[PDB]
Design a protein around this ligand. Structure first.
Ligand SMILES: *[C@@H]1O[C@H](CO)[C@@H](O)[C@H](O[C@H]2OC[C@@H](O)[C@H](O)[C@H]2O)[C@H]1O
Lengths: 35, 299
């Protein structure tokens, strides 16, 4: 399995090879919406 | 007396040297069997999908638990994950790229779509089967779930409970963005939060016999809907049923939340604190707990 992509864009797995941006759900920031 | 068969199916692969999985299997099967009750002429069929090592593990667990306290007739059947994989692949190949982790089309992902083409995999003698996850805990006699087949409306092929996290609010973001007034991804009671695959009443006869269902299996239909919904997933059957469930809710008999009370709260802590409750709320006498995302089930 993979870990869900916390980003709203790109593939379903986090660190989608074909993604460069990460649009986070409201309230979150970072390359994996950490803080 | 005329013998009546009841069929259950559970995935049980990679179980060797996997104590966490064996413990879940233990929790699921012990509660199932302790609480199950069937008439004299009725036989409970337990189908397990396993590779050879997990078959041996399942047998050792099963002899410890059979025969059941209630004394009813119980038959154990194993199916080869590699045999089922090859049978599924032609049917299931085209949907893998949308619903598998991550890209694109791997044999090892095919089995996670078993339920979508189960009517083509099981012998035609089996008219209905209930597929169950091994991270459940039964709180009632499973025989009672079978009567939900009777509540299927014309045209419905599958019985399934809603997804209780906003994972699909998240998944459908772009479609939601382009359609402000959509119920796709909204919480109950009026929204469509998608489905959870933990408990599925697969009416194989209705699936075989549905012109609509059969069309949705075709590569170009899968592709058309995935594009319309901008849908990407990694949860397999769950993601496919969820998607076609948005287009064609007629196909699904929605089970009450107490038949699959999910306990995973992973999405609460990942951007959905506000709305989480609206999705997660389930009230009534719980019939089955689903300790999903490795969430311990209460006792
Ligand atoms: C996103 O990834 C996380 C971390 O691996 C998973 O735990 C999530 O799955 C959980 O939420 C959605 C439910 O439908 C799953 O049964 C549950 O494991 C996944 O969406």
């Amino acid at each position: 399995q993979c870990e869900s992509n916390p980003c709203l864009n790109g593939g379903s797995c986090k660190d989608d090879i074909n993604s460069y941006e990460c649009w986070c759900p409201f309230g979150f920031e970072g390359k994996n919406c950490e803080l | 007396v005329v013998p009546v068969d009841y069929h259950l199916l559970m995935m049980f692969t990679k179980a060797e040297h996997n104590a966490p999985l064996q413990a879940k299997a233990r929790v699921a099967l012990s509660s199932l069997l302790r609480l199950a009750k069937f008439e004299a002429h009725e036989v409970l069929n337990l189908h397990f999908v396993s590779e050879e090592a997990s078959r041996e593990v399942a047998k050792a667990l099963l002899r410890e638990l059979l025969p059941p306290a209630a004394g009813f007739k119980c038959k154990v059947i194993f199916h080869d994950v590699a045999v089922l994989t090859d049978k599924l692949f032609p049917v299931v190949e085209a949907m893998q790229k949308y619903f598998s982790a991550g890209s694109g089309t791997y044999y090892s992902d095919s089995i996670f779509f078993l339920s979508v083409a189960m009517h083509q995999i099981m012998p035609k003698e089996i008219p209905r089967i209930i597929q169950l996850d091994l991270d459940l805990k039964y709180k009632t006699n499973i025989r009672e779930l079978f009567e939900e087949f009777d509540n299927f409306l014309p045209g419905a092929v599958i019985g399934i409970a809603r997804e209780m996290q906003p994972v699909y609010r998240h998944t459908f973001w772009q479609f939601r963005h382009e359609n402000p007034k959509t119920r796709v991804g909204d919480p109950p009671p009026e929204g469509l939060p998608g489905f959870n695959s933990g408990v599925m009443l697969l009416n194989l006869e209705a699936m075989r016999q549905s012109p609509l269902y059969s069309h949705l299996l075709e590569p170009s239909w899968v592709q058309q809907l995935a594009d319309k919904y901008h849908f990407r997933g990694h949860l397999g059957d769950q993601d496919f049923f969820t998607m076609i469930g948005m287009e064609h809710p007629e196909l699904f008999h929605v089970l009450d939340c107490t038949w699959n009370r999910q306990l995973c709260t992973w999405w609460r802590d990942h951007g959905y604190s506000d709305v989480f409750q609206a999705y997660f709320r389930c009230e009534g006498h719980v019939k089955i707990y689903h300790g999903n995302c490795n969430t311990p089930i209460p006792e």
